[PDB]
């Protein structure tokens, strides 16, 4: 019956931060495990 939200910038900032963290984790996912290669 209430609790209205009129702000959207923090949500977009958090979404962008989560996307950047996921991209970083996917980029560093290659060099992991005993069967991994090296980067140049």
Partner 1 sequence: RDNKQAGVFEPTIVKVKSLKFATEAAITILRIDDLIKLHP
Residues that bind partner 1 (CB under 8 A): 30, 37-40
The residue (of 7 and 39) whose beta carbon lies closer to partner 1 is 39
Distance CA 12, CA 6 (A): 13
Residue closer to partner 1 (CB basis): 3 or 37: 37
Annotated binding site for ATP: 33
Annotated binding site: 33
Q: Are 30 and 37 in contact (CB under 8 A)?
A: yes
Residue 31 C-beta: closest distance to partner 1, Å: 9
Cα–Cα distance for residue pair 10/23, rounded to 1 Å: 20
């Amino acid at each position: 019956k209430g609790a209205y939200q009129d702000r959207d910038k923090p949500a977009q900032i958090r979404f962008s931060n989560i996307s950047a963290a996921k991209a970083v984790a996917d980029a560093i996912r290659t060099s992991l495990g005993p069967k991994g290669m090296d980067k140049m």
